[PDB]
Amino acid sequence: LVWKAMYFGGIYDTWAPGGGDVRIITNPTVSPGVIFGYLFRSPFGGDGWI
Amino acid sequence: EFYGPDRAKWLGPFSEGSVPSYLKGEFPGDYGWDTAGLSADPETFARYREIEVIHARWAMLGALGCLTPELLQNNGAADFGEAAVWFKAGASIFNEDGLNYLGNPSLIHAQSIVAVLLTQLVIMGAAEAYRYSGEGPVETSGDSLYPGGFFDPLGLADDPDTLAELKVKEIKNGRLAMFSMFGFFVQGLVTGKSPLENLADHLAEPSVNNGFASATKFLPLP
Amino acid sequence: MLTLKIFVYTVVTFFVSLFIFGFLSNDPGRNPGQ
Amino acid sequence: VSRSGGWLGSDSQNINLDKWYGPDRVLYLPGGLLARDEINPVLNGTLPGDYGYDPLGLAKDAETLAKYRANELLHARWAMLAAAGAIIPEGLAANGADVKGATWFETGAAMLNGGTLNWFAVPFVNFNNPLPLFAVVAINVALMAAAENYRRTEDGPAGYAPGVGKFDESVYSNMDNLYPGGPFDPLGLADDPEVLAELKVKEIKNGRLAMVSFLGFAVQAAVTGEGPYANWSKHVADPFGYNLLTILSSEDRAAVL
Amino acid sequence: VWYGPDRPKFLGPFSDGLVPAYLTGEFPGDYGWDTSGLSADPETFKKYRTIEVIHARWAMLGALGCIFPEVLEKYSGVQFGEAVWFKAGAQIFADGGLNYLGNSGLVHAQSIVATLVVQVLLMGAVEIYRANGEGPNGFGEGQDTLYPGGAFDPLGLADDPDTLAELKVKEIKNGRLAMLSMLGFFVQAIVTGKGPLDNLLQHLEEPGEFNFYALYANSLA
Amino acid sequence: VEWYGPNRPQFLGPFSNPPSYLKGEFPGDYGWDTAGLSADPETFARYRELEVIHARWAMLGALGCVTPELLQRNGVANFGEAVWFKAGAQIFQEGGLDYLGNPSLIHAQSIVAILLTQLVLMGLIEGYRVNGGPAGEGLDALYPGEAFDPLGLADDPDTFAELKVKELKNGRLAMVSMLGFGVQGLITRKGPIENLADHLAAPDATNFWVDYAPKSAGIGY
Amino acid sequence: LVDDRLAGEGTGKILGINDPSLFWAITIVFTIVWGVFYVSTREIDAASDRENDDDFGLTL
Ligand code: CHL
Ligand code: CHL
């Protein structure tokens, strides 16, 4: 999946600047705080877990 | 008291269980201190004893030599400039007038760093080589550490009982010199001033001008 | 309210920890058969 | 003491010759598809890489098998040198190295019209090789003809090899036609009989892989008209966009929608 | 598991051609690492063994003590004068003096000489008792000089000799880890100039961007 | 006799009083153990192995620390950082680390890949050296030979003994030069080849005693 | 504003830890329970009459 999103064409990004389009992901977010933030987030409103 | 089983020890009255078995008060300076067992092997102990005595003797020479020029500078017996401080005497050889003994240009008046270095290599190289050899033109006893004979003009080692006790005096004055010399090295690095200037500052304000005044001098900064 | 939150976090963690280490205490061996 | 040993610590040397030699040797078809009694009897599991694979019944006796194995091992060793030598120089040029005649099927043309080649001692300095084409043809033919004749006649001149030091003509005697050893084994990796048997299996298996690979290099050259490195680099760059099917299309496929 | 000829060794599968003969597995933490032959002599090995355990127990206290005030300052309401371990010494020169937990009612030390005199008197007496093997009025007569027990084991966690052998491996291995990490605290203090907790929290912010090689390696030469 | 035995040369020329344990049985025995460090036969063995391994590493390092700089000074090749104490910083440059400057060679980009591969590669290599492995097992620890002597230059026992003395003497010289590179680099902050050029250009003015010695106390370099 | 509140609702905080004190509440409690559990594992297993070797545990 990450090879598809970074080297083979890319993944459709609905948030892409200029309108939703297929986009190459060049800076994946691998920060531990961001990853752990999603995993141990609440499942309730506003948080929604992952 | 300085030899045998009831000799003085590094921990005083509380040194019974701290003395290694191989330290039996047979040599000068045996306060039974070897918490690292570095002298457990008899052959390495003998070599370490020679290194200690040679170091102790250089330190006694060094401690006196690191203060004598500064004392003369203070009382006005001679002028050295910045060379009065022991850790600045080396650059003196690079002065336009040259290294003048006692500040007198009619004395050594050395100018060449190579000459003072090559001369020392030949002289000390010969002197040290004879010491390692254990034999030489001079007359000595069979002890390499304690030659006597030629190196004992005054017969102070002739009496054997006094010789054993004087040996303790040599190592004990020597060890104090080595500790003080380490103090000269560290104080020179930390304070940056001469040992006598360090002493004067401690006397001026003992509670403030002490080692902890420079305790924060080498704080690593981001 | 933080005092209340810390008290509840202490209480909830206590009962969950008992539940977790309770089943780690050779639970499967606690059966009447052989 | 031994000149052989394991690679992953003490007791890490586990050379199982049973999988490659004997009745339970692996076969080109699994157990449930091919019974071991359906294998040609001449393939008894004594030669390296005997997968029991010989449809068309080409090998009908030990002599025929021995003659063909002499051919297979030579075709395999040459393909291993070629496979490595056909793609390594091209990979250098594609990455910025100054190599004239990168693609293997275009190196010959580079020597035409008096042009020369650059030999790259890759770890270190490159070379502007002065040998002209006429000279290269003469030297290569002379050295290769002499080398092959020595192999054909099973005898050669005395010389020096590091493993054996200085040797005479006597060493050429008692050398296997396919596994000469001796001077040809300077590192002495053939000393252990169990290791030698296993390494023989790796030789033909890497060799058979190289032969099929060079066949692809040739077929690919005819179709795509590019060097093997260029085909690989662009398959990896855009796999679905650059493969055999896309090339065969040879047209801008209209969107289906 | 940890004793005898079948104990684990420091080079794993390759640790068999360099295990010294004198390293047999009779002492805790014996991974057969003496490649420089320093402990060839049994008497020197005995002393080196005490030095390691002592350096280890100080390191374990040091490792915890060097990070605990820094942890407590960031993740609690405590406000130390200097939470960073290599700046906590200068607290005694501050106007308010050294206040334990930042509370002026605790300790409130204000003279470095008085603390030093009390330390050399207390640590001097204590280290003498360990060295001599018996405290005041023969407090520790007969107890092991490295593993005393008795008064030093109030909870009796090492009454069973088999448990003792296992736990002595735990002590030396946590101790060796602490010693290795205290080396980290020293060098990271020299190079980064920040507290060890700050170094960790910086690694965790973005490990690729905030590490030794991406920040400081180029400056060291 | 010339290099082994009681008639061997000594570190102090005529004045020769070799320690008893030094009996000219091993290569490079000039009877120099004034500190008595190798009095223990087991420790001496361990020390001899350390010296040979250090010497072989030093010989590779000494040649490897001047080769990039010699090529750069002679304009033979361009390196991102030819000076040895700066070569490591090349990994953090823009295009990465290119061998000999040619972008088609190695072209490494991540220090983590270099570190992890070296950990695995050198971990196996050193394990093979001490426990034995693919190249052979049961071979001499310091002088395995076999695959490591393909040319057979050590086939003659006499030549092997003399060549072993040559290895240590070239190795010991390389070890001293490595200390020189480090100390000179830490002081001059310039590559060793550049430092040599300076001494040859004006030896009476760029010598250490005149250039830095006078500024080693109270004044910066 | 007129009143005070934690204002942590819908903020995506790890384990809902708005302040570091909650971390100590969870960590201390878990460590204590883990502490009493850890020093009792051998006794609990001893009741099985088997040793917790590679063949221990309910197995069909
Ligand atoms: C009665 C108690 C008594 C005590 C406690 C000591 C203690 C000591 N004696 Mg001793 N002695 C004692 C009685 C006697 N001695 C001697 C005769 C001798 C001799 C001849 C010698 C000693 C020596 C020593 C020292 C051993 C070396 C050392 O560093 O030790 C361990 C000590 C420490 C590890 C100190 C710990 C640090 C301390 C708290 C200071 C604080 C350090 C800094 C603040 C940290 C800064 C960090 C920065 C730089 C990063 C040591 C402190 C030796 C010496 O002089 O060593 C220097 C020595 O050669 N004693 C006699 C005559 C018979 C005694 C009679 O009672
Ligand atoms: C991070 C980016 C990075 C990049 C872009 C490169 C790029 C390169 N590296 Mg390098 N490296 C990189 C990082 C690193 N390298 C190394 C360690 C090395 C070494 C040790 C070597 C290189 C080499 C090379 C060059 C090889 C190309 C060549 O000349 O081939 C020429 C062609 C060939 C050698 C053969 C054909 C290659 C082509 C890929 C065919 C592949 C065929 C396979 C059958 C494919 C199989 C696929 C699988 C999935 C089935 C090349 C320019 C080599 C070199 O120096 O080149 C001269 C080399 O020997 N690198 C490390 C240290 C761990 C790195 C760390 O980051």
Ligand code: CLA
């Ligand atoms: C999880 C799937 C799986 C597993 C664990 C096994 C396991 C086994 N198979 Mg079996 N098999 C499978 C799937 C599987 N098979 C499928 C899908 C087919 C149809 C092609 C077969 C057809 C088959 C036959 C005809 C035989 C076995 C045999 C065997 C036994 C050993 C010999 C062997 O490996 O033969 C098979 C070897 C291969 C099929 C070579 C395939 C090449 C590689 C492994 C393909 C990998 C491609 C890639 C990873 C797939 C991507 C994932 C995909 C789902 C998208 C062995 C226990 C033999 C046996 O039972 O002995 C009596 C035997 O005769 N298998």
Ligand SMILES: CC1=C[C@H](O)CC(C)(C)[C@H]1/C=C/C(C)=C/C=C/C(C)=C/C=C/C=C(C)/C=C/C=C(C)/C=C/C1=C(C)C[C@H](O)CC1(C)C
């Ligand atoms: C085994 C082997 C074998 C072979 O043969 C040889 C060889 C190699 C030699 C060997 C090895 C060795 C080693 C590794 C060593 C290391 C060590 C260390 C690191 C230590 C530390 C060590 C360290 C340590 C103790 C530490 C300590 C600390 C302490 C006390 C304390 C501190 C502190 C605190 C709390 C806080 C504050 O604020 C500050 C202070 C006050 C400061």
